[PDB]
Short mmCIF file of C-alpha atoms (C1' of nucleotides) in Angstrom, two decimals:
data_model
loop_
_atom_site.label_atom_id
_atom_site.label_comp_id
_atom_site.label_asym_id
_atom_site.label_seq_id
_atom_site.Cartn_x
_atom_site.Cartn_y
_atom_site.Cartn_z
CA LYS A 1 -2.46 -14.88 82.47
CA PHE A 2 -4.93 -17.89 83.12
CA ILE A 3 -8.09 -19.53 81.71
CA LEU A 4 -10.53 -21.39 84.03
CA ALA A 5 -13.73 -23.38 83.18
CA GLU A 6 -12.92 -22.45 79.61
CA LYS A 7 -15.17 -19.53 80.80
CA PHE A 8 -13.15 -16.92 82.71
CA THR A 9 -10.05 -15.16 81.89
CA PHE A 10 -7.90 -14.00 84.79
CA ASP A 11 -4.75 -11.81 84.84
CA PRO A 12 -3.30 -12.47 88.30
CA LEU A 13 -0.53 -9.86 88.32
CA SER A 14 -3.18 -7.14 87.92
CA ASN A 15 -6.06 -8.61 90.22
CA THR A 16 -8.43 -8.67 87.41
CA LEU A 17 -11.14 -11.19 86.30
CA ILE A 18 -13.22 -11.43 83.26
CA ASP A 19 -15.85 -13.56 81.60
CA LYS A 20 -16.93 -14.70 78.08
CA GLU A 21 -20.58 -13.58 78.94
CA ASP A 22 -19.14 -9.92 79.85
CA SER A 23 -16.31 -8.85 77.37
CA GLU A 24 -17.04 -5.60 78.92
CA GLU A 25 -17.08 -6.07 82.70
CA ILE A 26 -13.96 -6.80 84.40
CA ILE A 27 -14.21 -7.29 87.89
CA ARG A 28 -11.70 -6.11 90.56
CA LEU A 29 -10.47 -8.59 93.17
CA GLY A 30 -9.32 -7.52 96.56
CA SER A 31 -5.70 -8.52 96.79
CA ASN A 32 -6.71 -11.39 99.12
CA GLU A 33 -9.03 -12.94 96.71
CA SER A 34 -6.62 -12.66 93.86
CA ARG A 35 -3.78 -14.07 95.75
CA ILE A 36 -5.99 -17.09 96.50
CA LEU A 37 -6.95 -17.69 93.01
CA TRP A 38 -3.38 -17.42 91.94
CA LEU A 39 -2.34 -19.95 94.25
CA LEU A 40 -5.15 -22.37 93.89
CA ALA A 41 -4.19 -22.21 90.13
CA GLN A 42 -0.50 -22.69 90.43
CA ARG A 43 -1.50 -26.15 92.11
CA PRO A 44 -5.05 -27.00 90.45
CA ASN A 45 -6.93 -29.74 91.77
CA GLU A 46 -4.91 -30.24 94.78
CA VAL A 47 -5.87 -29.43 98.39
CA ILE A 48 -4.61 -26.23 100.02
CA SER A 49 -3.69 -26.19 103.67
CA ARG A 50 -5.90 -23.45 105.38
CA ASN A 51 -2.69 -22.15 107.01
CA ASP A 52 -1.06 -22.24 103.62
CA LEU A 53 -3.40 -19.91 102.19
CA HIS A 54 -3.46 -17.75 105.25
CA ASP A 55 0.35 -17.30 105.24
CA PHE A 56 0.73 -16.58 101.52
CA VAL A 57 -2.12 -14.09 101.43
CA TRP A 58 -1.03 -12.12 104.56
CA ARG A 59 1.96 -12.01 106.73
CA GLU A 60 4.91 -11.53 104.09
CA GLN A 61 4.02 -7.99 105.25
CA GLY A 62 3.44 -9.16 108.73
CA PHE A 63 -0.15 -9.51 109.04
CA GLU A 64 -1.20 -11.81 111.82
CA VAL A 65 -5.20 -11.60 111.12
CA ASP A 66 -7.81 -13.99 112.70
CA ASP A 67 -8.52 -17.33 110.97
CA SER A 68 -11.95 -16.15 110.20
CA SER A 69 -10.85 -13.64 107.48
CA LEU A 70 -10.08 -16.43 105.24
CA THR A 71 -13.38 -18.07 105.38
CA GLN A 72 -15.21 -14.83 104.55
CA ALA A 73 -12.79 -14.07 101.55
CA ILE A 74 -13.49 -17.51 100.36
CA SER A 75 -17.55 -16.74 100.49
CA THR A 76 -16.59 -13.45 98.75
CA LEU A 77 -14.64 -15.12 95.95
CA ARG A 78 -17.71 -17.41 95.56
CA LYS A 79 -19.94 -14.51 95.48
CA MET A 80 -17.85 -12.93 92.89
CA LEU A 81 -17.53 -16.10 90.85
CA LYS A 82 -21.45 -16.83 91.41
CA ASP A 83 -20.50 -20.47 92.72
CA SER A 84 -23.44 -22.12 94.52
CA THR A 85 -22.40 -23.27 97.95
CA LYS A 86 -23.27 -26.63 96.93
CA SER A 87 -22.89 -28.02 94.15
CA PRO A 88 -19.70 -26.01 94.01
CA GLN A 89 -18.44 -26.00 90.38
CA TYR A 90 -15.14 -24.05 90.79
CA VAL A 91 -13.97 -24.34 94.47
CA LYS A 92 -14.63 -27.22 96.94
CA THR A 93 -14.08 -26.96 100.39
CA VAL A 94 -12.14 -29.61 102.09
CA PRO A 95 -13.21 -29.94 105.64
CA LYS A 96 -10.50 -29.35 108.11
CA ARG A 97 -8.00 -29.57 105.34
CA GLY A 98 -8.46 -26.41 103.41
CA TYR A 99 -9.72 -25.69 99.78
CA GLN A 100 -9.57 -27.21 96.37
CA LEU A 101 -9.38 -25.87 92.81
CA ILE A 102 -11.56 -28.51 90.73
CA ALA A 103 -12.37 -26.26 87.73
CA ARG A 104 -10.28 -27.36 84.54
CA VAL A 105 -7.49 -24.79 84.01
CA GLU A 106 -6.01 -23.45 80.92
CA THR A 107 -3.02 -21.19 80.15
CA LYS B 1 -57.26 -64.29 109.88
CA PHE B 2 -55.27 -61.61 108.31
CA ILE B 3 -53.65 -61.07 104.68
CA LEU B 4 -50.60 -58.96 104.16
CA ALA B 5 -49.35 -57.31 100.96
CA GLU B 6 -52.04 -59.90 99.22
CA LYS B 7 -49.21 -62.39 99.76
CA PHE B 8 -48.91 -63.77 103.15
CA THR B 9 -51.95 -65.21 104.87
CA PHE B 10 -51.68 -65.18 108.80
CA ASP B 11 -53.88 -67.31 111.11
CA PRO B 12 -53.29 -65.82 114.32
CA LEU B 13 -55.05 -68.57 116.12
CA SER B 14 -52.77 -71.23 115.09
CA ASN B 15 -49.70 -69.14 114.79
CA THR B 16 -49.22 -70.18 110.91
CA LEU B 17 -48.29 -68.02 108.07
CA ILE B 18 -48.53 -69.05 104.39
CA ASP B 19 -47.30 -67.62 101.06
CA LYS B 20 -49.17 -67.72 97.67
CA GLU B 21 -45.77 -68.65 96.57
CA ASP B 22 -45.97 -71.65 98.72
CA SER B 23 -49.85 -73.01 99.05
CA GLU B 24 -47.53 -75.89 100.29
CA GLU B 25 -45.40 -74.66 103.15
CA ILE B 26 -46.79 -73.72 106.40
CA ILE B 27 -44.63 -71.46 108.28
CA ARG B 28 -44.79 -71.89 112.03
CA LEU B 29 -44.28 -68.82 114.35
CA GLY B 30 -42.80 -68.99 117.95
CA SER B 31 -45.79 -67.46 120.17
CA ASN B 32 -43.86 -64.28 120.52
CA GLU B 33 -43.88 -63.30 116.99
CA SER B 34 -47.33 -64.31 116.05
CA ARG B 35 -48.19 -62.03 118.98
CA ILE B 36 -46.27 -59.22 117.76
CA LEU B 37 -47.87 -59.68 114.08
CA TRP B 38 -51.32 -59.93 115.47
CA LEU B 39 -50.87 -56.62 117.25
CA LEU B 40 -49.05 -54.80 114.77
CA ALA B 41 -52.18 -56.00 112.42
CA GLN B 42 -54.99 -54.81 114.67
CA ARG B 43 -53.44 -51.43 114.72
CA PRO B 44 -51.86 -51.20 111.35
CA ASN B 45 -49.75 -48.38 110.19
CA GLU B 46 -49.78 -47.09 113.62
CA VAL B 47 -46.68 -46.90 115.70
CA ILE B 48 -46.58 -49.23 118.59
CA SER B 49 -44.47 -48.54 121.56
CA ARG B 50 -41.58 -50.73 122.50
CA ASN B 51 -43.24 -51.28 126.04
CA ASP B 52 -46.59 -52.02 124.46
CA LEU B 53 -45.02 -54.88 122.43
CA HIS B 54 -42.97 -56.17 125.56
CA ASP B 55 -45.95 -56.02 127.84
CA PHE B 56 -48.52 -57.68 125.55
CA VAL B 57 -46.07 -60.24 124.46
CA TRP B 58 -45.01 -61.14 127.71
CA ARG B 59 -45.87 -60.70 131.49
CA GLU B 60 -49.77 -61.67 131.76
CA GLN B 61 -47.76 -64.71 131.78
CA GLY B 62 -45.27 -63.34 134.00
CA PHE B 63 -42.07 -62.71 131.88
CA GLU B 64 -39.35 -60.07 132.67
CA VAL B 65 -37.26 -60.37 130.05
CA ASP B 66 -35.07 -57.45 128.83
CA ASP B 67 -35.61 -55.36 125.82
CA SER B 68 -33.20 -57.21 123.62
CA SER B 69 -35.81 -60.36 123.41
CA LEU B 70 -38.11 -57.97 121.53
CA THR B 71 -35.47 -56.68 119.15
CA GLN B 72 -34.62 -60.27 118.50
CA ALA B 73 -38.23 -61.28 117.90
CA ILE B 74 -38.47 -58.61 115.41
CA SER B 75 -35.41 -59.71 113.59
CA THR B 76 -36.86 -63.28 113.74
CA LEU B 77 -40.13 -62.00 112.37
CA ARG B 78 -38.80 -60.03 109.55
CA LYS B 79 -36.51 -63.28 108.71
CA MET B 80 -39.99 -65.24 108.37
CA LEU B 81 -41.34 -62.57 106.06
CA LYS B 82 -38.40 -62.22 104.02
CA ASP B 83 -38.47 -58.47 104.87
CA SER B 84 -35.34 -56.78 104.24
CA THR B 85 -34.41 -54.38 107.04
CA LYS B 86 -33.48 -51.55 104.89
CA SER B 87 -35.76 -51.08 102.72
CA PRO B 88 -38.50 -52.95 104.26
CA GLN B 89 -41.89 -53.88 102.86
CA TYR B 90 -43.71 -54.90 106.10
CA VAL B 91 -42.27 -53.61 109.43
CA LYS B 92 -40.82 -50.19 109.90
CA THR B 93 -38.57 -49.40 112.95
CA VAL B 94 -39.23 -46.09 114.47
CA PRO B 95 -36.28 -45.27 116.69
CA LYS B 96 -37.07 -44.97 120.13
CA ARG B 97 -40.71 -44.98 119.57
CA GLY B 98 -41.17 -48.68 118.45
CA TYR B 99 -42.26 -50.58 115.42
CA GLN B 100 -44.91 -50.17 112.80
CA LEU B 101 -46.82 -52.09 110.13
CA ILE B 102 -46.57 -50.37 106.88
CA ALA B 103 -48.03 -53.36 105.02
CA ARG B 104 -51.24 -53.53 103.07
CA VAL B 105 -53.62 -55.49 105.29
CA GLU B 106 -56.79 -57.44 104.91
CA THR B 107 -59.10 -59.51 107.04
CA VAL B 108 -61.08 -62.93 106.80
"C1'" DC C 1 -36.26 -69.15 123.91
"C1'" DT C 2 -33.51 -66.17 126.51
"C1'" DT C 3 -29.23 -63.77 126.48
"C1'" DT C 4 -24.55 -62.47 125.04
"C1'" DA C 5 -21.16 -60.88 121.59
"C1'" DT C 6 -19.89 -58.53 117.37
"C1'" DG C 7 -22.03 -55.51 113.76
"C1'" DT C 8 -24.58 -51.43 111.62
"C1'" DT C 9 -27.36 -47.68 111.78
"C1'" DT C 10 -29.47 -43.46 113.76
"C1'" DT C 11 -29.44 -39.56 116.93
"C1'" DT C 12 -27.18 -36.47 119.85
"C1'" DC C 13 -23.60 -33.14 120.49
"C1'" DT C 14 -19.51 -30.70 118.97
"C1'" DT C 15 -16.86 -28.67 115.86
"C1'" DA C 16 -16.00 -26.35 110.95
"C1'" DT C 17 -17.40 -23.30 107.80
"C1'" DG C 18 -21.08 -19.73 105.16
"C1'" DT C 19 -22.96 -15.75 104.79
"C1'" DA C 20 -25.32 -10.98 105.80
"C1'" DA C 21 -24.49 -7.27 108.65
"C1'" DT C 22 -22.18 -3.60 111.05
"C1'" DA C 23 -17.53 -1.37 112.24
"C1'" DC C 24 -13.55 0.70 110.47
"C1'" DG C 25 -9.27 2.77 108.05
"C1'" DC D 1 -15.54 2.38 99.81
"C1'" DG D 2 -13.14 -1.89 100.31
"C1'" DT D 3 -11.36 -4.83 104.44
"C1'" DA D 4 -11.81 -6.71 108.78
"C1'" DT D 5 -14.63 -8.51 112.59
"C1'" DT D 6 -19.44 -9.74 114.35
"C1'" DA D 7 -23.54 -12.15 114.64
"C1'" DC D 8 -25.99 -15.54 113.43
"C1'" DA D 9 -26.98 -19.79 109.97
"C1'" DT D 10 -25.90 -24.26 108.07
"C1'" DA D 11 -23.15 -27.96 107.11
"C1'" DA D 12 -19.95 -31.57 108.48
"C1'" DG D 13 -18.29 -34.47 111.81
"C1'" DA D 14 -17.61 -36.90 116.15
"C1'" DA D 15 -19.57 -39.45 119.89
"C1'" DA D 16 -23.17 -41.58 122.22
"C1'" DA D 17 -27.37 -44.26 121.60
"C1'" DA D 18 -30.27 -47.44 119.51
"C1'" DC D 19 -31.29 -51.28 116.94
"C1'" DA D 20 -30.00 -56.00 113.93
"C1'" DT D 21 -28.05 -60.29 113.78
"C1'" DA D 22 -25.09 -64.03 114.33
"C1'" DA D 23 -23.46 -67.37 118.15
"C1'" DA D 24 -23.86 -69.39 122.46
"C1'" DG D 25 -26.55 -71.65 126.45
#
DNA sequence: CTTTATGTTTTTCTTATGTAATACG
DNA sequence: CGTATTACATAAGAAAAACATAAAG
């Protein structure tokens, strides 16, 4: 289990995400997004290779999807988190390098 | 005679420029720059084409100089005014359209 | 005064990423 | 009804073009 921005609880091994605003409302996370978060967390405030994310999220079960699916899933994740395009508080895009987890991370 | 920023006094007809800082120091302007200033002044805050300048500042007495001369004259002129390129107090450059006189201008 | 040479800023052009919308298992 | 891909939209970067200035002639 993980703690993020001192505001969100996240149980990865169940793909589930909660907020101190809403003790009531867990949000489901599509396997993709959850894995994304899990990985960005294990290595916080580091930059993650676009491909690194791609590969950890898909093809262990084979899946040679297009590159765009990642970009979508990202946007999806910030639409769940309600992180503004810019200024981003939780997840910074690093152009041509990948994505970075800037939110502070508790455990 | 013209007055700029309530600071510089510009006599175009003797190419002289004087600062309220310096009642003493007369600054002499190479003809080119005085002419530029005269023009920019008579059409203040308007954008002057790069060619309008070129032509007015030369050619009636001939000259087929290149564009660089203009650019240089401007740098020169701003040096006379202690005008900092960015950010300017007197003379704006307007990419591909020319130069423009933002300053506050009076007449005598 | 012109021009030339070296430096800095702007604009144009190309690539990277973001969504909202349609297609799909 | 939750993913993929689709179609535009915006942001970032790169490259070409313009301008600024310090030196030479």
